[PDB]
């Protein structure tokens, strides 16, 4: 039976939460650790551990995610942005794009918090990972950690094509773009995938299921939603929970779990402040307006909401090249062959994310001089004296990411961009004490004028990259900015021959132009016959934009910018009275304790007072390792006890052990 | 291939089936009511008095329903469609054409003059709104193809609304991995129509989609 | 990030280059080693490591090769021969036929260079390989090297059929035709394939990727073309490179890499002299004519171009026998089954090259007396006192090698011949300082009259072999010499019954003779009923040729002879002033140093002053091991440091370890 009282209680079993619970259970096996999670258990679930099927988690009827609505925003041209987040054990790590990315060294220094500097955190960064690839800088990577990272067991050929194109734009190839220092470069992009097994690497399997399979002091409580935290004599003593599915309205149930030594809140950036607010932590006026009795005056709870702002731009590829489009469209024979190969030996398209190459970039001084004055000033204030921070990221996806029922048949590649350190800020707050109730949510996407120019810049840049790739065969008009019809910057579709190739030999309407829905790509320049064949090229024209074109791109950004699921900041570390970066007031001290109460820490991405220049799973893991260490120290543990090594059979490299995959 | 095979096989058998039609099964000739006229450009209101008012047998617009998409299928999503086909009956616009050389093969200097007279715009706008209302009141109707409709302001209540989640999944098939994946906000979904009147005889029950209101920005689009 | 300065720089990551870079990185791991390659990275690329798909690399639109054009030649009846070479990391070893062949002991002795005698090189020969098959002479083979050689995991039945036929011609079976001494014999032909994995063995995976996966001092720089070598104070100090694809003509880019200790040039026989010539090494008159300022007077650069001259002769096989033709043609179901077996356990047709048996031959004194007087004299001068040198090679391929869209449907086997030590010589030279520019190229194929007789001889010999094989079912007239129509030596196609078998039961034109495009094979002799069944035979007639027939074969050779991709000699080792075998002047000393400069070695096939009696991957590897040792000694290393052992997990044999494939 599940005990009613634990020593340590971890709320939310996501990317950070599962890591924290697993580490703490190995701190001392006489400690009873309870992990509470609203979503389903993910143990040996193929819909979690098979990499290649990851897009289905973002279907609106998905069971593995929640879809939070927000208020209409004039900055998004009236849109009420939908902000998804994980609803399953493992959290984001069970359903993410599997992109491996580290921030810059200055990111964590700029937290302005004791013990959270990169110099302090670097051994914890290495602690998490086993780096399953060639390494020229092993001093800043780990090779024994429970989370395995690799290039997967399949690489779509867009990889080196993208790198050649990006090099010609002044974006240099590097062996490691995740070296905590480089802010302008291109690389072969790593994945949260164990190449030995061909499986996704998630926090639950790495830290929780491994532990539970070899020890007895860790308890797993899924399908259980955390309502509020109960305070007794200034100490966080208990948690009230309700079922995640209210299936008996005639007599609703609830449970109370107690903690003797420690409670850690890890429900994620969106949900953690809601828990705190329901517990009486926040702005007294707003709390009372939501029917909650105030307990601790902390106006910072739910404030300082940050994210990365992303958008997708799809391109036509030539019929001979590969993509995952037919697979994710639902072609039976192709799905059968892809699964068969994985069952055979764990290789093939199922063992990758198809996100094979990407870029971190900063503007040149000339490029800056062409942008909004507002961002030029923002650059001086935030970026100019921080040479290691990237402004934009984008990467190439070997297929269309999005709804295939709303795009024409054929094969695609998608440019995936996001803004690294937005100036915009949002907020979130409960509407009632009902734990099921939808919160009042303003993500704040693009509400600061400084955030527009980099996004416009990135679209133009990635489009230029795309047009210089061998894969390129055209631009999907419906999913590009709505340029003036006869603009020389307009989207140009695949030509007649390519259309007929995709239409097949029996088609009766390929190249039927009547209606003027699209305009065709023109033939590229001829190969130089005086050159060696392997150096010959066929080039498409560079694109020039006027003010009308730029206007179209801006509206494009406003209408198709989304969350990149990297939400952070709603429980910021900082001085309670506030700071320049935490204007509404800090929520946590430098040891992640919630102000105004004892025995309560927050350990997830809500912690970050300012942003990080990376996809945020590395940040979540780092926060997890750090939070576990903080708890351990607080409970009087030291030295090797703080290792908190989880059960793991290490395979190393093939040439050393003969056990890892060749 | 299989559908083409069956269609040809039926025609070879006895000359019947889909091969023996154009799929253009019904249509319309229309004139504006005096109220509709009062909402149109002043230029066409004057054109109507000059050309149509004393000629009661002349239609202003035609449109018909095509049982499929007419156009390039490689530039529209998979699935099944129906198309409203409109044209203007007596345009005021005029064009011209002339040879460029005595070469019989030479391309002529050609100005068809499409829409160069300002009076020709209002009836076309009118016809789009009319046929759209027809479409939304048909049992066949399941949504509007946003890429092939006017570029309304994104949050306009007149914007094109695509097929919903369930219909997308039906077209995507049971193995699909991205039907209803909204991220990117490329389309917006049709809402559920009104409920059937349970107090009515089943064959008279209906499910209705909303009428559309347009402002000046919509009309511009 | 990729450093701008290395200790050692290796230019070209081909068969030799990857070996050299890998060895040197293990010489001392404090040494920074940079490997620059124009082609793509080949790491875990199935289009490289799957043996059975190798023919696609020679499609004219292949990404993995460059196709160099040459000047029209009267000796090839006006043809401008196309000379392909590799354009990918691993070089030739990533795309070759996978035939394992060693030269004769006298070949390396005849280099006339100190330290390059077979006695000196023999331990380096063994060092490279792990010999995964039965060995009666283990003293001259290796069993611990990183390059695994084997008979693959599938053998087409043409193997023993060929050996029985060749034996009846006076060509004796041997257990090892690669024993450095035998010049007249037949054998089961070895492959550059690891039988444990069923994968191709290439230099990049063996020496480079293995090293980079376990050490940090080796850097990989692909998609990067070497322009020229920069000399500072008589020392090779830097390399200028450009992208392999010029994708930004408005502002072309370039990079400079520096070397502290050593530069090794390994761009291959075709490309290495081009690099030297662009660097100012060559004939001053020709250099100035090409717009390059002379630096070092070395007229030998680009001279002494040698190769093996090959041709293919396809034969019809009986419908019941196997070939890879349907697989290569693109039959979906057969391709599916072949891949499925390989995924299952690494066996089947995908794990072989289909080149199962072959021959090294010398003419008998009678055969010699029937040949051109010019070659009879050439034989006395070159071969008579060198009893270990073969004159011709040919082998049997279990399918048609060539364009299947230009040959009738059905199944085939192909005789693959090449001339071992041609007397002909060619040359190559840049046309401008543009690194992309096509060179002025005269391969010199068949320009010496002495080279014709052996080729004619070999065609007649292999044809006789073919007609004595059980597989034999006819001769493909369109791909054979254009004999006089009614000659008794003419090509005879498959008969009526066999045509109907291949045509299938629904055919309406098999055996429709009208047009007289072909003539049918007659029935062979009857079986001897008085003999034991397993000794019964059915024999086709021997062929007699007159002068008109011989004329047809000569024109056949002139019109269908090609490079065998074994090009060598353009940077010959020898005295700078010249020699009898290096008439235009030596380019390198016996330590492979380029004359007139310090700190620059050439390490690839361009090194060889005279030819070798073998497919040249063993030579490339040997040159690689030798060059690495030379560099190591020069830098002051000795003893076990010169081992330069690369990371490897050894599996040995099954009965010893239980780890290797049974
Ligand atoms: C679709 C998608 C793709 C992504 N792609 C990438 C990528 O490629 N690379 C990358 O690095 N990052 C990616 N991210 C982001 C990911 O790294 C997240 O930032 C990370 O999971 C955040 O970790 P946490 O802060 O622990 O929140 P998480 O969302 O991971 O964890 C919170 C957990 O608490 C549970 N929970 C919430 N409220 C609760 C309540 N009231 N009671 C009980 N339980 C509750 C949730 O179910 C969840 O499991 C992606 C995210 C998503 C959603
Ligand atoms: C299709 C094919 C089949 C073959 N079959 C066989 C066989 O069965 N058995 C056998 O033993 N041999 C075979 N050979 C020959 C093979 O062994 C070659 O002789 C061997 O690879 C030569 O080795 P290298 O001299 O290192 O040159 P390689 O061509 O191997 O290496 C040269 C490298 O330099 C790179 N390069 C060239 N110019 C450059 C520049 N300007 N800048 C940067 N990089 C540059 C190239 O990309 C290449 O990787 C075959 C060759 C080919 C092409
Ligand atoms: Ca500042
Ligand atoms: Ca009138
Ligand atoms: Ca001699």
Numbering used by the authors:
A (entry chain E), C (entry chain G): 2 to 663
B (entry chain A): 333 to 553
Reproduce passages from the article.
The methanol assimilation pathway is initiated by the oxidation of that alcohol to formaldehyde. This reaction is catalyzed by the FAD-dependent alcohol oxidase (AOX; EC 1.1.3.13), which belongs to the family of glucose-methanol-choline (GMC) oxidoreductases. Like other members of the glucose-methanol-choline (GMC) oxidoreductase superfamily, AOX1 exhibits the characteristic two-domains topology of the PHBH fold, containing a FAD-binding domain (residues 1–155, 192–306 and 568–663) and a substrate-binding domain (residues 156–191 and 307–567). The mature active form of AOX1 is an oligomer comprising eight identical subunits, each carrying one non-covalently bound flavin adenine dinucleotide (FAD) molecule as prosthetic group.
The final model of AOX1 was refined at a resolution of 2.35 Å to R and Rfree factors of 0.1774 and 0.2049, respectively. Analysis of the crystal packing revealed that P. pastoris AOX1 crystallized as a homo-octamer with approximate dimensions of 121.8 Å x 133.8 Å x 134.5 Å, which is consistent with previous studies on the AOX oligomerization based on ultracentrifugation and electron microscopy. The octamer appears to be a tetramer of dimers, but can also be described as two tetramers positioned face to face to each other. The two tetramers interact exclusively via the substrate binding domains, while the FAD binding domains occupy the outer surface of the oligomer. Comparison with the structure of CO, the most closely related structural homolog, indicates that formation of the observed oligomerization state of AOX1 is mainly facilitated by insertions involved in numerous interactions between monomers (residues 326–351, 486–548, 247–251, 638–663). Interestingly upon enzyme oligomerization the PTS (residues 660–663) gets buried inside the octamer. Interestingly, the omit mFo-DFc difference electron density map contoured at 3.5 sigma level clearly indicates presence of a modified FAD, in which the configuration of the C2’ carbon of the sugar chain attached to the isoalloxazine ring is changed from R to S, hence being an arabityl rather than a ribityl chain. Importantly, the change in chiral configuration at atom C2’ in AOX’s FAD results in the formation of a new intramolecular hydrogen bond between the arabityl C2’ OH group of the modified a-FAD and the N1 atom of the isoalloxazine ring system, which most likely modulates the redox potential of the FAD cofactor. Analysis of the crystal structure of AOX1 reveals that the active site is completely solvent inaccessible. Importantly, the substrate-binding pocket of AOX1 is reduced in size with regard to CO, due to the replacement of CO Ser101 to AOX1 Phe98, CO Tyr465 to AOX1 Trp 566, and CO Thr 376 to AOX1 Phe417, and in addition is more hydrophobic what could explain the preference for methanol as substrate.
